[PDB]
C-alpha cells in the first residue's frame, strides 16, 4: 500500500443503520484503515461537557479533527460516524449515507436496549432524514450517495459496489 494514493470514505447515517458492520467488512476486504469515531473518542477520552437531555458525554469535535488529521492527509481511511458537519470537507473523496426503513431500524435499536426517549429521538432523526441532509449540506452533491441498509443482501451489494469504486479511484489516481 506504501506509495499508493488511497481514497478516504465517510460512512454516516442514524445510529443502527449499519455503518460499523459495513465499515469493518470494507476494511477487511480492501486493506483500508477503519476508524470508528465514537470508539476513538472513548479510547482517547475526547470529550468536553455532558449532555443533560440525551445523557452522554459530549464529543470534543476539534480534538477529534486534530486526532485524525494527519492520518486522513495520508489517505486510505474509512471513517464511521453518525454525523459529519464538523469534519474538514477535504478529508473525504466520497460520502455514503446509509438508510434504514424506520420499522427495521426500530427493531435494531430496541434490541440495543435503548429506552423510549432514546428510541424516539433516533427514529425521528432517521424519518426526518437529518443526517442525510447534514451530509448534503457539508459535501458536494455529486460525492454524497444514499445506500439502502435493510437486508443482508444489501450489505453485500454495498460492500461490492464500494470495493469496485475504490479499485477505480485507485487506478484513476495512480496513473
Ligand atoms: N444491511 C443489513 N442487513 C441486516 N442487518 C444489518 C445490516 N446492517 C447492519 N445490520 C445489523 O444492524 C445492527 C446495527 O448495525 P451497526 O453496524 O452496529 O450500525 P451503526 O454502526 O450504524 O450504529 C447490527 O445488529 C447489525 O448486524
Ligand atoms: Li446512539
Ligand atoms: Mg505499494
Ligand atoms: Mg456503530
From Swiss-Prot:
> What GO biological process, any one, is recorded here?
nucleobase-containing small molecule interconversion
Q: Which GO terms describe its cellular component?
A: Cajal body; centrosome; cytoplasm; membrane; nuclear speck; nucleoplasm; nucleus
Q: Does the keyword Metal-binding apply?
A: no
- What molecular function does GO assign, one term? ATP binding
For the protein in the UniProt heading, the enzyme class is: transferase
Give the primary localization class: cytoplasm
Region annotated NMPbind sits at 36-59
Record key words, sorted: ATP-binding, Cytoplasm, Kinase, Nucleotide-binding, Nucleus, Ribosome biogenesis, rRNA processing, Transferase
Catalytic activity reads: AMP + ATP = 2 ADP; ATP + H2O = ADP + phosphate + H(+)
Its family?
A: Belongs to the adenylate kinase family. AK6 subfamily.
Q: What does this protein do?
A: Broad-specificity nucleoside monophosphate (NMP) kinase that catalyzes the reversible transfer of the terminal phosphate group between nucleoside triphosphates and monophosphates. Also has ATPase activity. Involved in the late cytoplasmic maturation steps of the 40S ribosomal particles, specifically 18S rRNA maturation. While NMP activity is not required for ribosome maturation, ATPase activity is. Associates transiently with small ribosomal subunit protein uS11. ATP hydrolysis breaks the interaction with uS11.
Q: What is this protein called?
A: Adenylate kinase isoenzyme 6
Q: Which organism is it from?
A: Homo sapiens (Human)
| Gene name tied to this protein | AK6
